[PDB]
Amino acid sequence: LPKAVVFLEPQWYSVLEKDSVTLKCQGAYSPEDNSTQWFHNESLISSQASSYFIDAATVNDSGEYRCQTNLSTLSDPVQLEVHIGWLLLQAPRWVFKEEDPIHLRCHSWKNTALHKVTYLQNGKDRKYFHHNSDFHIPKATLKDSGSYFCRGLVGSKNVSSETVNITITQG
């Protein structure tokens, strides 16, 4: 009767190439069959462990991920997106409820450092940071809906991220 769940570790749905992602399956097992079945898009993959680890993500790792065990039925789809760029604005989801926490992160490419970071909403500055820190909105309002992106300096390069559209619902 219980359904399995796929968790992303770290919580970000959108990753950049070369990033590490661990997809966890939460299900029930019986001593006879200890394996886990993983599904990429609609196709069965080779991983039989509790957690599927992607050491260095490629564009081919994008898509829907599902999992099931012998005692847990097929899980709901979990989407993973892989981008190529100097910067990326990450969030746990793109749809939030009102009074819900929003954790945004301005993530730069592997082995690169970022400074003079600016988080923007609808073309306007929300928060500036001299050094790379995350952007936290503990309680989301209806004023928090819109187009977000982050801009910063990777050494000398003035680079901006692609747009993420955040939707805020009431119920």
SS3 category, 117: strand
CA–centroid distance for 20 within its chain: 11
Instruction: Name the β-bridge partners of 115.
Output: 131, 153
C-alpha closest to that of 83 among 12, 23, 142: 12
| In the chain, domain spans | 1-85, 86-171
Q: Which residue has the tokens 């990429």?
A: 40
Q: Can you tell me the distance from the alpha carbon of 6 to that of 27, in angstroms, rounded to the nearest whole number?
A: 9
SS3 category, 142: helix
Pairing of strands 164-169, 95-97: parallel
Pairing of strands 43-44, 21-26: unpaired
Query: Which CATH superfamily does the domain covering 1-85 fall into?
Result: Immunoglobulins (2.60.40.10)
C-alpha closest to that of 157 among 105, 122, 113: 113
Resolution value, angstrom units:
2.5
Is residue 6 within 8 Å of 24, Cβ to Cβ? yes
SS3 category, 60: helix
Torsion of the alpha carbons at 134, 140, 142 and 147, rounded to the nearest 10: 20
Q: Dihedrals φ, ψ of 144, to 5°? A: -80, 0
Amino acid in the structure at residue 142: L
Amino acid in the structure at residue 80: L
Instruction: Kindly state the tokens that stand for 50.
Output: 């509790």
Domain topology for 86-171: Immunoglobulin-like (2.60.40)
Q: Can you tell me the distance from the alpha carbon of 80 to that of 41, in angstroms, rounded to the nearest whole number?
A: 10
> Experimental technique used?
X-ray
Query: How many C-alpha atoms does 112 have within 13 Å on its Cβ side?
Result: 22
